[PDB]
């Protein structure tokens, strides 16, 4: 019966079943069938002047005509080929640049933060995902509710970097919130010679321990994969880091930024003590290299030389210097980072 | 909860027209009827026949001007005249609109044995009343 037929929208809404009890508490794709259809084209292959063929031909009005059986077979076959090509394009899969692992979000880039309302831009900043977590909350009515918590880091590769958390029901909304918020909570990280830290950093944030070592050029980033990601955003090229205790990603990130932001440059050390900061390099021999001098007056009394420093040592550093550190996992060959 | 002819609230990205934005209890209060004839007046006959004709004309025009209608049809009857007022888009070339007007008016006149006329009002896009 002609009167029992429905529209395409009604037919797809029922067949897809996107709405329903089955899709509420975790309990098929649409296709536009009017896409490649031309008004006037039918199975019989009639040529209606002014609708599916030109109205006038050679200055005269065309008359009703019909394609031959052979000529109509070509039109039908051509329409099926046009359909396969259109469908083939959709099956084509884009080549993803995977993150830390194939199915992880960590390490994947999200692009630059969105441009601000007042014509503000951040093309110089890159965004990286550090963690994606599905958090659940119990509600009175709906029960177990699902949400997304994301941790992203931003940086321009020249010392300015920051991180932020994003929360939303949808993952892409959490990505937007996180990276747009991180660009308003930027730290500035001092870098020695624009490639490493100024001195060894050892700190604890809550229960996460981070120990970072200043390294020479060519050493690379031998650190926790999340620290490597953040170092690339900051612009640090050479550093060693070891994470101990709790390996909480958020505590690791927050602890890393605290340590890197609270480091004393050589100029700050020269001004605080009113002395020259002299660098000694084994590749340059005994040549003393002044890296910083006090802007104010220069002291005349030498720094007291304590025969034995009462500094606390790390047993792992001492045990390694004495060749007593044995581990099949240390100093392994890895890809360039 | 009532469902009949109610476009349900969403995230604020669903454009709805004026007619679609009003539930049935607003008929005769904030929105008029899409068909006007004498069949439903007290003491008048042939309401059943006018109804079948209206249902067919709406399906006929929907499939005859595919993807062109920007709103529901307005069907008017005076004497034995039948006027069809439709709001269409400006995507098809004018030549095809003139072909379909001449074709549909003639076909419907012979089908229902009455003079039929089709009045087209074009709009650049679907007129949005609100975003639900």
């Amino acid at each position: 019966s002609f009167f029992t037929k429905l529209t395409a929208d009604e037919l797809w809404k029922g067949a897809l079943a996107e709405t329903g009890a089955g899709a509420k508490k975790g309990r098929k794709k649409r296709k536009d069938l009017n896409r490649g259809q031309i008004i006037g084209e039918g199975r019989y292959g009639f040529l209606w002047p002014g609708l599916n063929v030109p109205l006038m031909k050679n200055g005269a009005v065309q008359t009703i005509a019909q394609r031959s059986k052979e000529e109509q077979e070509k039109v039908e076959a051509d329409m099926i080929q046009q359909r396969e090509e259109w469908d083939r394009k959709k099956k084509m899969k884009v080549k993803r640049e995977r993150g830390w692992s194939g199915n992880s979000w960590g390490g994947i880039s999200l692009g630059p933060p969105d441009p601000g309302p007042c014509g503000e831009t951040y093309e110089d900043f890159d965004t990286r995902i550090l963690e994606v977590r599905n958090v659940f909350t119990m509600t009175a009515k709906e029960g177990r509710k699902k949400s997304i918590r994301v941790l992203v880091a931003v940086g321009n590769g020249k010392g300015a970097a920051g991180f932020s958390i994003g929360k939303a029901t949808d993952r892409m909304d959490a990505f937007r919130k996180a990276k747009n918020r991180a660009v308003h909570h930027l730290h500035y990280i001092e870098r020695y010679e624009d490639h490493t830290i100024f001195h060894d950093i050892s700190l604890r944030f809550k229960r996460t321990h981070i120990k970072m070592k200043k390294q020479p050029k060519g050493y690379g980033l031998r650190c926790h994969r999340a620290i490597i990601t953040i170092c690339r955003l900051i612009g640090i090229k050479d550093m060693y880091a070891k994470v101990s205790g709790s390996i909480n990603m958020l505590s690791l990130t927050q602890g890393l930024f605290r340590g890197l932001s609270r480091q004393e440059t050589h100029q700050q050390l020269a001004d605080k003590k009113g002395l020259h900061v002299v660098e000694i390099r084994e590749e340059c021999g005994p040549l003393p290299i002044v890296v910083a001098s006090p802007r104010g007056p220069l002291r005349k009394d030498p720094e007291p030389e304590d025969e034995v420093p009462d500094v606390k040592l790390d047993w792992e550093d001492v045990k390694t210097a004495q060749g007593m550190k044995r581990s099949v996992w240390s100093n392994l060959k890895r890809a360039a980072t | 909860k009532n469902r009949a002819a109610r476009v349900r609230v969403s995230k604020g990205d669903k454009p709805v027209t004026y007619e679609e934005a009003h539930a049935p209890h607003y008929i005769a209060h904030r929105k008029g009827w899409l068909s006007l004839h004498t069949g439903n007046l007290d003491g008048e006959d042939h309401a059943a026949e006018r109804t079948v004709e209206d249902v067919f004309l709406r399906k006929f025009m929907w499939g005859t001007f595919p993807g062109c209608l920007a709103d529901q049809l307005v069907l008017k009857r005076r004497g034995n005249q039948l006027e069809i007022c439709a709001v269409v888009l400006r995507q098809l070339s004018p030549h095809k609109y003139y072909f379909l007007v001449g074709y549909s008016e003639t076909l419907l006149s012979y089908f229902y044995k009455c003079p039929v006329r089709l009045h087209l009002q074009t709009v650049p896009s679907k007129v949005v009343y609100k975003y639900l």
Binding site: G99, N103, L110 | G12, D13, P15
Partner: peptide, 17 residues
């Protein structure tokens, strides 16, 4: 297979007073 698919999109200009 992999499902960590990033798919960027922006809301529609449906927020204008």
């Amino acid at each position: 297979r992999h499902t960590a698919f990033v798919i960027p999109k922006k809301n529609v200009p449906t927020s204008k007073r």
